[PDB]
Amino acid sequence: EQLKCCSGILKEMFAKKHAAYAWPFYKPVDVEALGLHDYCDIIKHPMDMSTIKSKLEAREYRDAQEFGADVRLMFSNCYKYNPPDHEVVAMARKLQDVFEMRFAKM
Numbered sequence: 001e002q003l004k005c006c007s008g009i010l011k012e013m014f015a016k017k018h019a020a021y022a023w024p025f026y027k028p029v030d031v032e033a034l035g036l037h038d039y040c041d042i043i044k045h046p047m048d049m050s051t052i053k054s055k056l057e058a059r060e061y062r063d064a065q066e067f068g069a070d071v072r073l074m075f076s077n078c079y080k081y082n083p084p085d086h087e088v089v090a091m092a093r094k095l096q097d098v099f100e101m102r103f104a105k106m
């Protein structure tokens with residue numbers, strides 16, 4: 001099953017090797033603590049790694065493509081909300097490189 005391959009992708013994205021850039025994506029953006037009160041006006045469908053992990057464990061993805069769409073949604077939200085020169089955008093790109101290289105191996 002390619003959903004076993006999806007659990008592997010998440011283990012890689014949560015690994016210590018990538019923590020320096022993956023950490024802002026581990027949990028939902030805490031809009032209240034960060035003062036990002038315009039976030040929900042710009043981002044219609046928030047997504048993060050812990051939510052993807054919960055969805056995967058709860059059989060909410062029919063296949064690897066549905067799983068992949070939520071991972072790409074997480075990165076697209078980051079690219080849409082932040083200015084392009086923001087530190088978090090560079091971090092999203094580094095994490096997206098980890099994901100895309102592993103996802104391509106299926």
Ligand SMILES: CC(C)S(=O)(=O)c1ccc2c(c1)-c1cn(C)c(=O)c3[nH]cc(c13)CN2CC1CC1
Nearest residue numbers: 023024025026027028029030078081082087088
């Ligand atoms: C529990 C945690 C995940 S957090 O939610 O406290 C948290 C803490 C800080 C943090 C994020 C989220 C953040 C995430 N993302 C997806 C965005 O698009 C952001 N734009 C701006 C920020 C974020 C501000 N910074 C990241 C900045 C240093 C590089």
